[PDB]
Chains A and B, each alone.
With several copies, the nearest count.
Chain A
Amino acid sequence: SFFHGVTVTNVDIGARTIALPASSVIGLCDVFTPGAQASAKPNVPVLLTSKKDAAAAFGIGSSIYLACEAIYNRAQAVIVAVGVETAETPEAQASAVIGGISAAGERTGLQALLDGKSRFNAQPRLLVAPGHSAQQAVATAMDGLAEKLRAIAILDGPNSTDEAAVAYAKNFGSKRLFMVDPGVQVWDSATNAARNAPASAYAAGLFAWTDAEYGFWSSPSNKEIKGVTGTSRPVEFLDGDETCRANLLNNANIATIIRDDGYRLWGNRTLSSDSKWAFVTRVRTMDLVMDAILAGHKWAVDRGITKTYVKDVTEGLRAFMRDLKNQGAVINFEVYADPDLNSASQLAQGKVYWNIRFTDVPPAENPNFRVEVTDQWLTEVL
């Protein structure tokens, strides 16, 4: 049938915070229970828009939604979220969250995040698996999937002390990994107690937040976190070059949480053995000025090389870089065609080369204030 006239219903909806900047996308993977209310097959990806379809695709009490509510508390981005069936032994659970080509012609586990584009038109640049990143074998599969996807993979640590978190970060150093060791404990309204969230979704919702108005060039290393209480372990920054718990963990290239009740994030540097790719900003800027160029250059591939083909795109690379200088993404650049690698033999196989040498803003991780108490303006008091 149908209805004529006004039919006043009575529903339960939350705040109207659904305003969506389509800037950063997050690849997520955690366990859940495929019930009747969870309308999502296990190993397939599901694009998420808000909490209303994160509660429709997966259940309320599922470990997806506990790791997906934390993202939408801070930034209302869009999430390419894959699920995984839970397992009994932790080795089979670690093998299932990785997944692979063990289906007929599909990708399971983390590998289904590689199907972000051509299914959803959202290639994930933020890779998280909260709780599972503390395992070594999952984080290595989290590692190798980031270089295939040009993404920042946010890792975890154990619940234990600082020594067992530094030792977890020594075997890494592969320029794409961002470790946050302190277990963020958070209040919930279901059981009226304090949970223990494994710190990934809060940093994932913070990387997607700082791209909305501060841009991808900016550092998310002193930003606020909403929907949060204290950490599992205290960690503070003090001064005087002592055994600070923050400085011991920054020197191991691990992010912490500093002020009261989960108030800030603290890490600038990736797990990188190379000194050039230390900061998170240089790794993100090199990965996010290119999709800002390769989109906008869906052309200049399979077109056909004319005489001024090279010139008409190297004046289009400059025009799509001068606006990056205008919005403060880069400091002064240079874009020019490569004179010696471009040759007539390379044109017959479609290969053409450019040089897009630029520089980026360094994040001010250390503002030093040299200060004394003089007695110079004491003659002002007379």
Chain B
Amino acid sequence: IPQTLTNTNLFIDGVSFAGDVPSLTLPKLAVKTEQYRAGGMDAPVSIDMGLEAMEAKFSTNGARREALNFFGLADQSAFNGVFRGSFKGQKGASVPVVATLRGLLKEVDPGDWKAGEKAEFKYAVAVSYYKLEVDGREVYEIDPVNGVRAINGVDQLAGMRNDLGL
């Protein structure tokens, strides 16, 4: 069934942004591949080295003071945050995609104020904790603190934590 995004939303502390956020971006989850070609093989094989640095953009076209007051404060991972998105589909009922993203607020980039255009305050979140849910059930859970990278319920770093004595 063809399925496409229809609406988005953004919560921080339960403070809703109903008609305030035009664009938001989930973090690009990229695994750290290194092209490994040893002796006895012609092509490189990529290998896991953990994940990359997660990075979450979102944007607001107005000064809200609920997204501005979480920039650069001394408590890292104080921006709690919830990215929501409803994927409708062709046959009626939708599928909710909920992601919570506990990190620090990296930058605030107000663009050019050209007196007759949109404000477009860029934001960026340096994600520490990340948990993607699709249709009310867990897909991802990324927290490098304690190392609990989990795919659809099972924990993929359960092997190394017994190896590292964690």
- Contact surface of A with B, Cβ cutoff 8 Å: 19, 306, 308-309, 312, 315-316, 319, 322, 325-326
| 9 tightest A-B CB contacts, nearest first | A312-B14, A315-B100, A326-B146, A326-B145, A325-B146, A306-B14, A319-B102, A308-B11, A308-B14
Q: Is the pair A309, B14 in contact by a Cβ cutoff of 8 Å?
A: yes
List of B residues within 8 angstroms of A308 by Cβ: 11, 14, 82
The residues in B between 73 and 110 inclusive whose CB is less than 8 angstroms from any CB of A are 80, 82, 100, 102
Contact, CB under 8 Å: A322 / B146: yes
The reply to whether A312 and B11 form a contact with Cβ atoms under 8 Å apart is yes
Q: Specify the chain B residue showing the minimal Cβ separation from A304.
A: B14
Q: How far is the CA of A375 from the CA of B11 in the complex (A)?
A: 34
Nearest CB of chain B from residue A21's CB, rounded to whole Å: 13
Q: Which residue of B lies closest to A328 (CB)?
A: B16
Q: Which chain B residues (1-54) contact chain A, with CB distance < 8 Å?
A: 11, 13-14
Question: Which of B11, B14, B80, B145 has the largest number of chain A CB atoms within 10 A?
Answer: B14
Report the bound CA distance from A326 to B91 in whole Å.
Answer: 13
Provide the residues of chain A in CB contact with B102, threshold 8 Å.
Answer: 319
Residues of A contacting B14 with CB < 8 Å? 306, 308-309, 312
Alpha-carbon distance between A319 and B131 when the two chains are bound, in angstroms: 12
User: Which residue of chain B has the shortest Cβ distance to A323 in the bound complex?
Assistant: B91
B→A interface (CB under 8 Å): 11, 13-14, 80, 82, 100, 102, 129, 136, 143, 145-146
Bound complex: CA of A319 vs CA of B130, how far in Å? 12
B162's nearest neighbour on chain A, judged by CB, is: A382
> What are 12 A-B pairs with beta-carbon distances under 8 A?
A19-B136, A306-B14, A308-B11, A308-B82, A309-B14, A312-B11, A315-B80, A315-B82, A315-B100, A319-B129, A322-B129, A322-B146
Supply 18 further A-B pairs (C-beta < 8 A) apart from A308-B14, A309-B14, A316-B80: A306-B14, A308-B11, A308-B82, A312-B11, A312-B13, A312-B14, A312-B82, A315-B82, A315-B100, A319-B80, A319-B102, A319-B129, A322-B129, A322-B143, A322-B146, A325-B146, A326-B145, A326-B146
Q: What residues of B have a CB within 8 angstroms of the CB of A326 in the complex?
A: 145-146
B165 to chain A, nearest CB (A): 13
Distance between Cα atoms of A306 and B136 in the complex (Å): 18
Select from chain A the residue with minimum beta-carbon distance to B145: A326
* A309 CB contacts on chain B under 8 angstroms: 14
Determine how close the nearest CB of chain A comes to the CB of B146; give it in whole angstroms.
6
B129: A residues at CB distance < 8 A:
319, 322
Q: How far is B101's CA from A315's CA once the two chains are assembled, in angstroms?
A: 11
A333 to chain B, nearest CB (A): 12
Q: Which residue in chain B gives the minimum CB-CB distance to A313?
A: B14
Q: Which residues from A are CB-within-8-Å of B80?
A: 315-316, 319
What's the minimum C-beta distance from A308 to chain B, rounded to whole angstroms? Answer: 7
Q: Which residues of B contact A19 (CB under 8 A)?
A: 136
Shortest CB–CB separation between residue B89 and chain A, in angstroms? Answer: 13
A301 to chain B, nearest CB (A): 14
> How far apart are the CA atoms of A315 and B136 in the complex, in Å?
14
A319 to B13, CA, bound (A): 13
Report the minimum CB–CB distance from B156 to chain A (whole Å). Answer: 15
- Give complex CA distance A329, B152 in Å: 26
- A325 neighbours in B (Cβ, 8 Å): 146
Query: Which residue of the partner chain B has the closest CB to A300?
Result: B14
Chain A residues near B13: list those with CB within 8 A: 312
Residues of B within 8 A of A306 (CB): 14
- Shortest C-beta distance, B86 to chain A (Å), equals 13
Q: Which residues on the B side are within 8 Å of A316 (C-beta)?
A: 80
Task: Enumerate chain A residues within 8 angstroms of B145, measured Cβ to Cβ.
Answer: 326
**Can you name the residue of chain B whose Cβ is closest to the Cβ of A309?**
B14
Please report the C-alpha to C-alpha distance between residue A312 and residue B129 in the assembled complex, in whole angstroms.
Answer: 15
Shortest A324–chain B CB gap in Å is: 11
| Chain A residues, CB < 8 A from B146 | 322, 325-326
